[PDB]
Amino acid sequence: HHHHVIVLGHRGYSAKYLENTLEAFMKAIEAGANGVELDVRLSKDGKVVVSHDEDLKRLFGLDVKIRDATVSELKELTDGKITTLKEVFENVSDDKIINIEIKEREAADAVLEISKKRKNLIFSSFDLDLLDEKFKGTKYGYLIDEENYGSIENFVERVEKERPYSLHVPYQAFELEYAVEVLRSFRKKGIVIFVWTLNDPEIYRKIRREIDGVITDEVELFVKLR
Numbered sequence: 001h002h003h004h005v006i007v008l009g010h011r012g013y014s015a016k017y018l019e020n021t022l023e024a025f026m027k028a029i030e031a032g033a034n035g036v037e038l039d040v041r042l043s044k045d046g047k048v049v050v051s052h053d054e055d056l057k058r059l060f061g062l063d064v065k066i067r068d069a070t071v072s073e074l075k076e077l078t079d080g081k082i083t084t085l086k087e088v089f090e091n092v093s094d095d096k097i098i099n100i101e102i103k104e105r106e107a108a109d110a111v112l113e114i115s116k117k118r119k120n121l122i123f124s125s126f127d128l129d130l131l132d133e134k135f136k137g138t139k140y141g142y143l144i145d146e147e148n149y150g151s152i153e154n155f156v157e158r159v160e161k162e163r164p165y166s167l168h169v170p171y172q173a174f175e176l177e178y179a180v181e182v183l184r185s186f187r188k189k190g191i192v193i194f195v196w197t198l199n200d201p202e203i204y205r206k207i208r209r210e211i212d213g214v215i216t217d218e219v220e221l222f223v224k225l226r
C-alpha cells in the first residue's frame with residue numbers, strides 16, 4: 001500500500017493511441033489518468049499546435065515543419081490528426097491536469113494568453129530561464145536534463161530563489177543517493193516532484209515514496225498500480 005501519485009499520460013495514452021492526438025488524450029482520461037502531458041509549438045499563422053517534433057517526418061513521413069504550415073495546412077496533411085491547444089482544452093475537463101511542455105520560446109506568449117481562462121495547468125520546459133522570466137504567477141516545472149541545471153549547487157540555489165511549483169526529473173536521477181537527498185529537501189519545502197518518462201513498474205515501486213507524480217506512456221498500468 002502506497003501514498004497517492006498523480007498519473008499523467010505522456011502525449012496522452014501514447015502506448016496504445018497515436019501520441020499527442022485528441023484520441024490519445026481522451027483515452028488517458030478514460031483510463032483514469034489525473035491528466036496528460038503534451039508539447040506545444042507555433043504554426044506559420046502563429047497558432048499553438050500540439051507536436052513534440054518540429055516537423056511531421058517521424059509520425060507522418062512528411063518533410064514539413066510545423067512553423068512552415070498553417071494550422072489548416074497541417075490538419076490537411078495529417079488528415080485531421082494534429083490538434084491545437086485550444087482543441088485540447090475543449091476536450092479535456094478542467095478538473096484534469098494538463099502539463100504543457102513549451103518547446104519554443106516564441107510560443108510562450110500565445111500559450112499564456114489562451115491559458116488565462118483555464119485552471120489545472122502546469123507549464124514546463126528545459127528552458128529554465130524562460131519559465132523564470134515569463135511564467136511567474138503560474139505553476140511551472142523545471143524539466144531537468146544532463147546539462148541545463150549547471151551544477152547541483154547552482155540548481156539548489158535556483159530552486160530556492162525562484163520557487164518552481166514542480167521539478168520534472170528523469171527517473172534515472174534516483175540512482176544517486178545525493179540526488180535523492182536533494183530531491184527530498186525540495187519536497188520538504190512543498191515542491192512537487194514528477195518523474196518521466198517511466199514505463200517500468202519495478203522502478204516505479206522502488207521510487208514511488210519519493211515522488212508526487214509520474215509521466216508515463218502506460219496509463220492503465222500505472223493507474224492500476226495506485
Ligand code: NA
Nearest residue numbers: 115116118119
Ligand atoms: Na490559467
